Amino acid sequence: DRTNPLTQIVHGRKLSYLGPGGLTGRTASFRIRDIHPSHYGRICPIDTSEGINVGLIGSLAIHARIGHWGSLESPFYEISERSTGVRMLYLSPGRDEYYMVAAGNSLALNQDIQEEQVVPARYRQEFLTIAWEQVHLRSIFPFQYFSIGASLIPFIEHNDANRALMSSNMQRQAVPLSRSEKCIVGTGLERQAALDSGALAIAEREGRVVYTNTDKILLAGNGDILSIPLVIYQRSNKNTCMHQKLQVPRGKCIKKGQILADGAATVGGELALGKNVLVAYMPWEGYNSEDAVLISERLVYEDIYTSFHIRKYEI
Amino acid sequence: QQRCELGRIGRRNMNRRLNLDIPQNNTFLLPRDILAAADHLIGLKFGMGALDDMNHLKNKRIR
Amino acid sequence: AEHVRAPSNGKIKFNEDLVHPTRTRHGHPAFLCSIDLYVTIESEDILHNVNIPPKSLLLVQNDQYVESEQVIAEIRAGISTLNFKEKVRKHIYSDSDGEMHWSTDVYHAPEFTYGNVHLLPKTSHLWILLGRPCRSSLVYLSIHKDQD
Amino acid sequence: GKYVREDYLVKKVSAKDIQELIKGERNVPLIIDFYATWCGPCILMAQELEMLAVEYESNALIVKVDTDDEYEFARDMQVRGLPTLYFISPDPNKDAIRTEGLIPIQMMRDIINNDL
Amino acid sequence: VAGRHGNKGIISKILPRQDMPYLQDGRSVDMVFNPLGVPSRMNVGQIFECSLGLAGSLLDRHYRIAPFDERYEQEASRKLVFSELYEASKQTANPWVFEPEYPGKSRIFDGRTGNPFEQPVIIGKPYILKLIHQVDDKIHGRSSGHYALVTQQPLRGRAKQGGQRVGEMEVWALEGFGVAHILQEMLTY
Amino acid sequence: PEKEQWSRWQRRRPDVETVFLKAMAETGQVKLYGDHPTLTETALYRAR
Amino acid sequence: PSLSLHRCGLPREIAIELFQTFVIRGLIRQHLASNIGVAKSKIREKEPIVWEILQEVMQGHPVLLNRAPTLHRLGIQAFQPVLVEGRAICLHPLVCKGFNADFDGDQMAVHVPLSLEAQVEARLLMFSHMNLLSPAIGDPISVPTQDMLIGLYVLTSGNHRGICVNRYNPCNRKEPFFS
Amino acid sequence: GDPVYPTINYIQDPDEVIDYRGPDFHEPTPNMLAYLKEHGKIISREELEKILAKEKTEE
Amino acid sequence: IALKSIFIDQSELPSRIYNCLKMSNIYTLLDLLNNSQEDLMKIEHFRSEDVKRILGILEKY
Amino acid sequence: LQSPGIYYRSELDHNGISVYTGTIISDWGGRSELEIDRKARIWARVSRKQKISILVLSSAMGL
Amino acid sequence: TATSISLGIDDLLTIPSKGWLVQDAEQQSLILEKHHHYGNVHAVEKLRQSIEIWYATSEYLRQEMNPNFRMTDPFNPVHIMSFSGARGNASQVHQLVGMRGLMSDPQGQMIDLPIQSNLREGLSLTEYIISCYGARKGVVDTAVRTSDA
Amino acid sequence: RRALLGEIEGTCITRVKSEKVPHEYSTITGIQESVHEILMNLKEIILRSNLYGTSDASICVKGPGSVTAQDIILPPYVEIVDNTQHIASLTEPIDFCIGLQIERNRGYLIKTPHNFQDGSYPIDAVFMPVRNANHSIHSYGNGNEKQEILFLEIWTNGSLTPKEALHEASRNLIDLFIPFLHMEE
Amino acid sequence: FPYPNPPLVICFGAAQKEFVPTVRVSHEQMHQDKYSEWKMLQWNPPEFVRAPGGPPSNVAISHVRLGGRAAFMGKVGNDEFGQEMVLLMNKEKVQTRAVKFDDSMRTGCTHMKIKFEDGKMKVEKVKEPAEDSLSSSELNLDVLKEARIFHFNSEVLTSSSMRSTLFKAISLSKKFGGLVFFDLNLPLPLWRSRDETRNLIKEAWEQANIIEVSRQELEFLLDEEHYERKRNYRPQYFAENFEQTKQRRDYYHYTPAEIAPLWHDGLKLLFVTDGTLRLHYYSPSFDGVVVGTEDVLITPFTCDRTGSGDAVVAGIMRKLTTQPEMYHDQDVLERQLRFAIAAGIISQWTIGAVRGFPTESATQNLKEQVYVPSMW
DNA sequence: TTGT
DNA sequence: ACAACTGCGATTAC
RNA sequence: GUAAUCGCA
Ligand SMILES: [Mg+2]
Ligand SMILES: [Zn+2]
Question: Which GO terms describe its molecular function (chain L)?
Fold first, then answer.
């Protein structure tokens, strides 16, 4: 799915129960489709497929990895005192059960030693409150329990969990516009999202940009010249235009990994699937009944939400 | 052959639940494994056991 | 199960001879009430009287000071047979390694012919003497012995 | 390294390597950087040194020395703190310039162009 | 159109800028949304976003915030939003951006009449996306063009220029209303 | 408890009502019982 | 929001395809088109008289709207199509409850009764003004729901009566009189 | 009052090009073909041509 | 306009008038320049001769 | 996909004690079940018939 | 349109006694945990006490929500939307201005960790993960309900 | 406010004719911007004119450099305001020749004739000179006679000064309100 | 006539952007080239670099940000770097009337000569302006008169042209009634041997009223191997206290007898910081320890401790200039040191010492949030 | 699968 | 052996 | 014309 750069990355993270040798939609029991405490940090608890296959198609956590034994593994910090005194271990699902994993902070003092403070923790697939002396592990990573779709929602704590799935599904539908603008408020994951989307020109060699053109970019390094071909008004699988624009000017040095050009729905190296417009929350003469929006003509005559769509016909 | 065609993963899991010292390499349904299975089964009747959750990730593999 | 709350901050005054001592389901001590009683919340300017005759739990004591909107008593009048009553079981998991100990009120014979299950005739405590359990082979037992 | 280019262009040399480089003859300016994995400021200094090495492909030599591996050598070089840069000139009569703390990349460029 | 917080809507009217409500600055709002969705679908982060966005636009800043900022303290998001709005109000002297009486809310006027509204409204600049589903793709209409070889019913699909289907749940409604001739015409000719 | 425990609710939540009550307590517009507005006074101000 | 219970907004690009035969007959009757082919070519050319004839055609014709989740009997109703300049079918707000419709992406179908008996049935039985009570318990199904209810509540809420309207007791001491 | 967590962490320049060589980004993604060639997993056409020519000359 | 970057600390001033300008929320030359002689005189502990001293030091530049 | 191994589920009968069963899962997908009735009754559910003798299976294995 | 009702952050008014109630509840919970470590009470008593006290606190908060709005801020936009009948319910507004209470984990077993924060203050990571259980149950319930209906 | 926004008219470029481009979604050698980017840049060219009708302009630049609004040759009636707006950038010695049609209208114009004479591309134009407007009414404190003070803030785009915009809005309002004082038809 | 109400202080030393003087040998090492894995060491930092301190300018910046007035005394060249640092200090409302400009030298660069002979033995041909301040004509006397606290680090002791200037400034400050704050912040050469560092810093130690030293520095000056063997002691058969049974991290409180060799008559307060986790205070009358905490893990990605110690010193100086009963009363001393602890805790969450410096409101908020109402 |  | 929401739209594969 | 897969409300 190449409707937008986000779809290309979120498509490859799907884990499916239904398939050859797996539970069919009808076959799947209710139990199969609910979160199990084991899914913490390894699977997304708010990304599913809406329909008859609800709870059967899910995404994969941001920090997860697949293990030697075929098991998804998650990164847990070890607060236990040792020689190194710090570790990041990808504990497997069965191993983390026999550990006191506390996700809370330590900013509490009650005239006693700090290790005597209490904190919610997880043990044997349960929740309980224990002292800081007895907690073996700690989950520090903020994006550990979510996926790319949910993590792009700012202030997700103040939103209901039910609407999170709707927002994740609707972020997938965005159309790349003729012009792109970054978001004033963001979660900070748009950078790596645009980096790993694949619609960005990243240099594979250090050097200087000797020649700049719309069709190609010439990068001269270590006595060798490399040519990078750009994309000019191509067509995706979902009838959405793909285009790239140069970001670096002529005569600047670029390392192996930096951004040479900006693809569609990406500006300054960050994912940009929309625009920033002034909004007021009030009823206006019924035009807002149910859900409906009243918009001004400025969005029309200034090309704020203009988009290009390309459809192919072949005989 | 298909019932005894336990994978390497299968061997490991069998060893975990039923304490066995069978080497990882011998990925076959040995009769000791069956014997042990029977032992645990009878032990479950007297309370010395724990049933297994089939929705646990540790009980699932990713292809 | 309505919960009676203190109308204002003040002392509680009632006659403890009418109420019978009991133990609440939360492990707390309380006074069982079976007859219409009058309790007085003695505040700076006013006195309040609130209580309900039927079987209720009094979670306070005479002369005790209580703050406003605290749970003084639990009416617990709602009581009936539950057709959906389920004998749910919960397990207690040890939080430290060691050995088991019981002094009294525990049967010395297993409930079944085979197994470690033991039954308790009366209430008692189970003591886990802290320690580190190791695995000892036949070879190690020859050199590793008691009090080494 | 023919098919895939190396990500980092600054090499970690030892103390004997630095002694041999200073003792020998050089045709390009030399830049010595003392770092430690632990110091926070050094994380930035390394990025600026990478940018400088990219800007100066073969007109200057940039090397880095880990203070944890060579502590006595760093102490003998009169190195007070970690974000320290040693600028060695090519001609061996001129005096070396030692800079301490985070300095702008333009300052490094001007030093290499004029002082060295 | 949609927002990142689960807010979705369909455009219903394109009013000119002169009819749009304007702030005390003098600028007409680009979109107007229904304020009754917040208690219904329980989306409170949208308010925060709008406000922070107004603040940023004025101060020329972009905010990349990791989720669950309330691990530091209580009402961390509220403190951040109100602090940034105050600063914007002080630096660009637009007193309206932060109202001490009702933080985050301002009093706007009507573009048509020019009279102020009674209660203050939320003014912000959220991130709105345009979704793939579009009206042009969904428009369809058939008169009498093509039929299936065996069934001889009209064809299916918008690209194939086919009509709409009258299912069993609609025949039931037609029979409950009592329109026998309409059902007969639809089922035969 | 003999020693005072720690809680996230130990502090008083800031509000517009408390700030306005502090602002109008000066200049003699209103009078409050003490130097810091209490929750009952904040509710009364929210009302009036 | 400015339509009546009997009127519904209908786009022109849909109406021209639905009522195409009627506008062909109109072009043939008036001295605007000689044959069916010339009339079809003129309709394809989007001539201005074609829209006038289309408006004159459907002034008394009923349109049958319906929804995909037709659970109750109010899923299919009848309205008077009004020509609009757009691609979105306008609907009266008070009639939304019946269709369980929200403007979040929902779509609807349109049906044109050809026979005179079908037209009479649609105009008499299936109209909205004749169906204002749900067939479950006979309760009003078309009532102010979200914004009109808020407006009515603001209108009839009242006024600050006690301590809110006055700071001191009026004992120590409404005004306007309208005929 | 002022937030405990510094706001300067959230603040970001609007017209800023994100440097993917920072401390918060992972290592650059290696091209699959070049990565397989450098480790010897996939040989070049020249090596296969030379091997086939040697096998033909031997026969 | 480089007057913004020219703080009063760089210009050599007596300690008394320096503290007076610091208390009067004057940190840059531009600010002083915006301020008028009468206004400057208003600041506490600021003598008329001081207005002369700051004017002379400014005219020196 | 579910990992191969031994699973030990239980199921309560309509009248009497709860039935305990152990299933062994293979890579191909074999199901060598084992069940226990109110008595010892260590019966495999491999055969479609009422039951099967675990002792007979062990003797065939080589015991 | 003339009045232009709107909802803001400061417009979500909590009852003026949430802090005291939550503080005494967590104090009693800590005392009971300490005495459970001593051996005065067993596990089932602690479970019952925690569940009952947090459910009672949530119910009292929801009960006192409406009188607070009626007496203190009668013209509150959230209160207007709830009382008029346009959109919202007492349970839904309790999630916004009160507390989410004790969510139930799958298989009908209580989580035992209370959600002491509403959507205005902001839930924690654990509380959000717990509410994910309710969201999944809701969506699967919606699907099965549509099919069965 | 309603007069300044929507009742004031201006002049903008409405049609652009390119020499040897296949379509408006392609790139021409020697220019950093595509045809669409050049059209978008020409769309934001502010002009000043006081007469109605269509006029013709052209752009004839050559050699490597940057073509701006100064290269545009205009009829004597039309003039340029900014004179330094960026039309396009040439990175090679090329001859850049383009034709422009200048029209004066009001409001916004939809580019309806997409299918038209080949080689000419129509660009939608917004003829609104006033960007934003605002007003505030402060009291005068005159006791019984409740007099007030009016303030007006006008933001134009250079085509006309704010005072000229105010006078034109006043004259347009008077022209709109005059017909009611004529004899009945 | 009277000085401004906030008491002014003086920070004396070298102005450096992000200098880290405290360098030792770390046992744990990360990847040499990948600087994206070096944040794992900020998380569990080496003992000596748990709460590092930097240039004196950072102390003045933090002091001004935490509320108060401060001035920097030093010399910087007329180059772009010196003017950049001066502008940075002025934008944050730090006084520079005691900062001198010399066109003859350039700030930050020290000319040296390799002179390889059996070893790489360098020598200083010229010195930087940051390390070259003349005692005679480069000391402003008015700032010394107004100053109540005089702050400087041992970095000035390394040079041979700034020791006399520091001694003259100390004498002039004591002449008008000011106090001397001495933060060791030992540089790399000062960690060779305890005897040489003790003999070199004895002169500045004698004339210092307030001295703040790290735990590692205090142990290094007091037979570090003894305390290293002490912390590793484990009871063989049975413990004698509850702390030994639970095996928590060691937080040793040094008895005044152990600190007696380092105690002089003119010493009022001695602070032994344990890296924003414990804080020890010593006075002629009373001795104690203030409990603290560290939560760098809460924000894993930034995690920079570069400016913690400077913020702690700034908060200590602020509370000493504001609260005059800290010397006499112990509980007030602890309640005020909690402020500096909270300041350090806030300062560890942001990369950049000058960038992530706490304000007074944020520090008070964190102090109230972390500590119970009785303690604050 | 789930139950009929 | 039998059945388990209603329809719509898009793609690729035969 | 049938499948597979996703989406829609
Ligand atoms: Mg809908
Ligand atoms: Zn938040």
Answer: DNA binding; DNA-directed RNA polymerase activity; protein dimerization activity
Q: Is the CB of G71 under 7 A from strand P?
A: no
Phi, psi of G122 (to 5 degrees): -65, -40
Which stretch of DSSP H or E encloses residue C86?
none
M69/C31 Cα distance (integer angstroms): 64
Who among residues 56-75 of G has its Cβ near strand O, under 7 Å?
68-69
Taking the C-alpha atoms of residue K29 and residue K11, their distance in angstroms, rounded to an integer, is 31
Q: Do M248 and A113 touch (CB under 8 A)?
A: yes
Tell me whether M364 touches chain F (CB under 8 Å): no
Residue I2 exposed, middle or buried by CB count within 10 Å (0-12, 13-18, 19+): exposed
Question: CA C67 to CA C45: how far, in whole Å?
Answer: 15
Distances in whole angstroms, Cα of residue M5 to Cα of each of J26, K9, M8, M91, M321: 82, 40, 9, 21, 10
Do E66 and A187 meet the contact criterion of CB atoms below 8 Å apart?
Answer: yes
- CA atoms of A275 and M34, how far apart (whole Å): 36
Of F48, F10, F12, the closest CA to residue F21 belongs to: F48
Q: Are I43 and I23 in contact (CB under 8 A)?
A: yes
Give which of E41, E5, E15 is closest to E110, Cα–Cα.
E15
How many whole angstroms separate alpha carbon I26 and alpha carbon M69?
A: 15
Q: How far is F5 from chain A (nearest CA, A)?
A: 5
Resolution, Å (one decimal): 2.8
- The answer on whether G139 is annotated among ligand-binding residues is no
- Which residue from K minimizes the CA distance to F44? K72
Task: Tell me which DSSP letter residue L89 carries.
Answer: E
Give the neighbours of chain H: at least 3 Cβ pairs within 8 Å.
A, D, E, M
Q: In the sheet where A245-246 sits, what is the strand order?
A: A201-202, A259-262, A245-246
Whether the CB of A26 is less than 7 Å away from nucleic strand N comes out as yes
Q: Cβ–Cβ of E121/K88 closer than 8 Å? A: no
Q: Positive or negative, the Cα torsion across M58, M59, M60, M63? A: positive
Closest CA to M363 of M286, M325, M308, M290: M308
Tokens (6 digits) for A193: 């999202």
How far is G102 from chain A, CA to nearest CA, in Å? 6
Yes or no: say if G22 and G97 are a contact pair by the CB < 8 Å rule: no
Residue keyed to tokens 């209660």: E119
The secondary structure element, H or E, covering residue A277 is none
Q: Contact, M74 vs M162, CB < 8 A? A: no
Which of M356, M354, M334 lies closest to M346, judged by CA?
M356
d(CA M260, CA M171): 25
Task: Mark the breaks in chain I: residue after which each occurs, C to N over 2.5 Å.
Answer: none
Cα(G100) to centroid(ligand 1), Å: 8
**DSSP reduced 3-state for J18:** strand
* CA dihedral of residues A167, A172, A174, A180 (deg, nearest 10): 100
Q: Do E18 and L5 touch (CB under 8 A)?
A: yes
- With a CB cutoff of 8 Å and minimum separation 6, the contacts of M75 are M99, M100, M101, M102, M129, M130, M132, M133, M138
Q: Which residues of K touch C3 (CB under 8 A)?
A: 56, 60
Q: Chain I partners of M97 at a C-beta cutoff of 8 Å?
A: 9, 12-13, 18
G104 is an annotated ligand-binding site residue: yes
Would you call A192 and H28 a contact, using CB atoms and an 8 Å cutoff? no
